[PDB]
Amino acid sequence: PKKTSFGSLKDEDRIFTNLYGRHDWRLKGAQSRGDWYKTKEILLKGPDWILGEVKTSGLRGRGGAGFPTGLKWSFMNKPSDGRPKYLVVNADEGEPGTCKDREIIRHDPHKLVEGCLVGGRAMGARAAYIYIRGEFYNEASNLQVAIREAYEAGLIGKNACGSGYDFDVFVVRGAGAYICGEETALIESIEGKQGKPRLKPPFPADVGVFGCPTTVANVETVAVSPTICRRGGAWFASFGRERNSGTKLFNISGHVNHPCTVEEEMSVPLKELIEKHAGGVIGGWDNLLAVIPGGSSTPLIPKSVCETVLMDFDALVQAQTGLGTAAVIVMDRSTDIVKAIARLIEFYKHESCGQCTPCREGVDWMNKVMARFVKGDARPAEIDSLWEISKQIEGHTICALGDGAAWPVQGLIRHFRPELEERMQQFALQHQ
Amino acid sequence: GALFVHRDTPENNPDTPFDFTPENYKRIEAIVKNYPEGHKAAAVLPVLDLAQRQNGWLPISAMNKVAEILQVPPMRVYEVATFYTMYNRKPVGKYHIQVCTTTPCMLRNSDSILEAIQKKLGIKVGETTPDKLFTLIEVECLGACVNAPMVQINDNYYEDLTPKDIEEIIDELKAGKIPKPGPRSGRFSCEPAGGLTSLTEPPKGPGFGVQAGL
Amino acid sequence: SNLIEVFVDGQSVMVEPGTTVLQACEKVGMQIPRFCYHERLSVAGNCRMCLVEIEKAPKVVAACAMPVMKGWNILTNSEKSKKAREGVMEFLLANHPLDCPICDQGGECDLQDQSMMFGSDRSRFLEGKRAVEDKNIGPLVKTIMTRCIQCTRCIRFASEIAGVDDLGTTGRGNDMQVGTYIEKMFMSELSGNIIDICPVGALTSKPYAFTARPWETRKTESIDVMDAVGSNIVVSTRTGEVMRILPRMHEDINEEWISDKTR
Amino acid sequence: EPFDNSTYRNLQHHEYSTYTFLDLNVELSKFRMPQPSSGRQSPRH
Ligand SMILES: Cc1cc2nc3c(=O)[nH]c(=O)nc-3n(C[C@H](O)[C@H](O)[C@H](O)COP(=O)(O)O)c2cc1C
Ligand code: SF4
Ligand code: SF4
Ligand code: SF4
Ligand code: FES
Ligand code: FES
Ligand SMILES: [K+]
């Protein structure tokens, strides 16, 4: 009735069986691994059944939102209105520490296109625009090879999978931006204009790409969608805590012996995951200083929090952080925490699209202030000023990049203020 | 300098000779046909990228020529070129060297890789070699963070880099030999160095764990 | 029958569905502070000063773009809104140049006046300000682009009321600059109007540049005679001399614009 | 045909070209069904 000891998943329930590219990633290998099997029956079941089984799965947005993917995808169950319906798969993967999208695309692309096909059918979309980032040129070419194989096999195109539905997938390359990862900015960049995000009184379900309805979904979420249809929401709901189901991927990087990727069951203990899959923190677990749970946007937590925390949405939310993209970055006692965070703010300043004032001016201001903090040329009152500034841009920006840049500062301040104090005192008496 | 105001120069002038090869033209029209009719302006980013491939760097003439074929006003084309980072508004030298400097890849001593390139090339961060072979600049996160410090040579990822390993890569480019894309270590793509902690069993065939219904 | 009902500061207001929060607040009389939102041009959202607190709602909404619905109490003077306005202006005045004594907008600058009403009384920005090279767009428009706040009012005006697409925004981040990239004069019969819409002294008039101050000129309404449209103008006279011909508002004849030959 | 889990068979990306992505995109065009028409030829027309 309850699998309290969540984690230690087995190979049978793993989705991306070809994660490390140890099997044929072409159509032949994907069909061998169990892809494109009874797809027509999924198509013939009807979009309501596809949406309904997603709610039973309790799938949450694996892109940094954690939204109830079933509820979100239900927004195009509305009848047709003359305008075409479009699906969009986010594949930017610009958040630091995030590598999962790269691996699925270049090692199991056929799952992705099938995900667009079943996803489009559920939401009634006409075509899927996979927005792969510009850097992933080899990945994009690998993705297109699978698309051509699917087109020749008759899985996609006119009468997709022999079910009457006509679905097409256009893989659109990026031109280099982290803000393109944002859903509305991605919708913007597809349209050909500058990649600034658009405000939302409206929503992509009503007004979106070319003005037609759209829904930006992460690569992982759509990729696991067909297997959810095959194995059921009940099978998917079995894993993970309540409201925390599924087997989210994990990108472990930083001061680990063997940084890697693993598709571990959700709500896994953080210590357990690092110990076996990654190999443990360099210099032993006691050498840990701080950990980035789910990417740069997610605030850091110290080792004391790291002692026992389940890797999921709710457990991290009560731990003053978020799951985000499950990008676990560890930082040992040899890591300059202030320098590392300042680099993250530097990245955010170099990636802000400059549209709204709080993100255009606040992030740059926070960059300059944090630069002084690294050198120590400041005063203790500046820490509080940095806190107020980070709150001023929080929730006042068009997209969640401003909140995505304010959280690391808030995370650093509330957990390493004595380190900041010591550095400033060190600067003070040195320059006497 | 990354300046966003183009001042006319003999090298980069609106009369600079640029056009599209016929093979590029059929590629362009296929790009435009991917988008719905009436919104052909959406092809600005891929088409402008096409001009980059056959020119290395795009001058103002390339950005104007993209405007004519796509009917987009030149100002909007200028917006896209300056906003996105990849578009080289200034000439670059053959192999473009991009080094990640974000925290996840810097935590594993990425500056050692940057220092190694600096020593072998002799070119300081930002400029280009006199023979126009390497253009060393730093870049933000490129996704491959679980892999060790890496580079983005031209259009290839070289992960799990090590200061001597990039020395081999540079001389291979200097001699014309292409370095193999992928990590420069035992790890193939992203697997743990010690061994496969998961997916050690043959994947189950079609129909496994499949409900009765569908 | 379609009129939905909202509570601007608690007082009930009848609003046509689809009405933005900003217009609903204007119905009572409260004018939400704004930079990017110009009534004639489209709505953008770069301003971020139109932010207001909706009752029992945790996120401050942008009144320039949010359409109201049933039973909303737009708390204009709520504390959270006031903190938001101070924060947004603090960012605006962070990199603004100290040109008030030498800026023509001095005395009629929206940034100046909104600082007096909705803004702090000091600065906590102990950094180095940014500077942006000037651009030339013709012998009519003063362009000190360092004072610009990227409200994109000029961009919207050029692409909507002028029809020519030569003003845009180049680059990202704080280094983003609004201009025309390649040097080119922004020339149209309505070119001089970008002086009026610009809330700061970034775009001002070269012929009148720093010859008078707004608080010392006497404004006299009149009718333009250069063209047959008969646009209503406000001729500003000081010490028996004519410096500026500003457009008036009529909503039928000239809306809020005049031709360059008129100005 | 084994469980050759010690081989990374995804090596096709090594021998790719500058124009590879746009090349097989063009070859893939014939499969694509006609795009929807928004009426006018451009948002400005
Ligand atoms: C600055 C920023 C960057 C983002 N980058 C990505 C990204 O690279 N991939 C992604 O899937 N979602 C990204 N998101 C989240 C999207 O905006 C959106 O919420 C999500 O893609 C929706 O799909 P999902 O529900 O499957 O996550 C980003 C958001 C922000 C604010
Ligand atoms: S938060 Fe930054 S990236 Fe997002 S819309 Fe505002 S300025 Fe652009
Ligand atoms: S634009 Fe306004 S704030 Fe800026 S210098 Fe002129 S008067 Fe002062
Ligand atoms: S120049 Fe004036 S109108 Fe144009 S964006 Fe800057 S402040 Fe706004
Ligand atoms: S951290 Fe080096 S690539 Fe993202
Ligand atoms: S008024 Fe709505 S953002 Fe400027
Ligand atoms: K002005």
* A15 alpha carbon, distance to own chain's centre: 17
Residues of B with Cβ-Cβ distance to C167 under 8 angstroms: 75
> Which residues are within 8 A (CB) of C80 and not within 5 positions of it... i.e. 6 or more apart?
C53, C60
Chain A: touching chains (3 or more CB pairs < 8 Å): B, C, D
How does DSSP classify residue C68? Answer: P
d(CA B138, CA A103): 24
How does DSSP classify residue A274? Answer: I
Contact, A128 vs A116, CB < 8 A?
A: yes
Whether residue A306 lies within 8 A of chain C, CB to CB, comes out as no
C36 known ligand binder: yes
Kind plus residue range of the DSSP H or E element containing C223: strand C218-223
Which residues are registered as beta bridge partners of A68?
Answer: A60
Q: C-alpha distances in angstroms, B8 versus C132, C170, C180, C181, D21?
A: 19, 17, 13, 11, 33
d(CA C156, CA C36): 10
Q: C-alpha distances in angstroms, A11 versus A280, A325, C82?
A: 21, 22, 55
Chain A interface disruption, residue of D5, D7, D9, D20, most A CBs within 10 A: D9
Q: Give residue A211's region: left, alpha or beta (phi > 0; psi -120 to 50).
A: left
CB atoms within 10 A of CB C15: 21
Gaps in chain A with C–N over 2.5 Å, residue before each: none
- The 3-state DSSP class for residue C13 equals strand
Structure tokens at B129: 């070699």
Q: Ligand 4 pocket test: which of C178, C196, C197, C205 has the largest number of ligand atoms within 8 Å of its C-beta? A: C178
Rounded to whole angstroms, the maximal C-alpha distance in chain A is 80
Rounded to whole angstroms, the maximal C-alpha distance in chain C is 57
Resolution for this experimental structure (Å) = 3.5
* A187 alpha carbon, distance to own chain's centre: 17
* Short-list B42, B80, B88, B71, CA closest to C169: B80
Cross-chain Cβ contact A340/B106 below 8 Å = yes
* Short-list C188, C171, C170, CA closest to C179: C170
d(CA C91, CA C83): 13
Residue-wise DSSP of chain B: ---S-----SSS-TTS-----HHHHHHHHHHHHTSPBT-GGGGHHHHHHHHHHTTSS--HHHHHHHHHHHT--HHHHHHHHHHSSSS-SS---SEEEEEE-SHHHHTT-HHHHHHHHHHHH-PPTTSB-TTS-EEEEEE---S--SSSS-EEETTEEE-S--HHHHHHHHHHHHTTPPPPSS-SSS--SS--SS--SS--SPPP-TTTT--S--
Angle at C251 between CA C245 and CA C256, to 5 degrees: 35
d(CA A348, CA A340): 13
Structure tokens at D42: 């451009």
Residues of B with Cβ-Cβ distance to D29 under 8 angstroms: 30, 33-34
Nearest CA to ligand 6 atom 2: C64
Question: Based on the number of CB atoms within 10 Å of its own CB, is C46 exposed (0-12), middle (13-18) or buried (19 or more)?
Answer: buried
Contact, B182 vs B157, CB < 8 A?
A: yes
* Short-list B179, B156, B155, B157, CA closest to B167: B179
Out of D5, D26, D36, closest to residue B196 by CB: D5
Q: Are strands B156-158 and B151-153 parallel, antiparallel or unpaired?
A: antiparallel
Kind plus residue range of the DSSP H or E element containing C21: helix C21-28
Cross-chain Cβ contact B38/D42 below 8 Å = yes
Between the CA of C93 and the centroid of ligand 3 the distance, in Å, is: 10
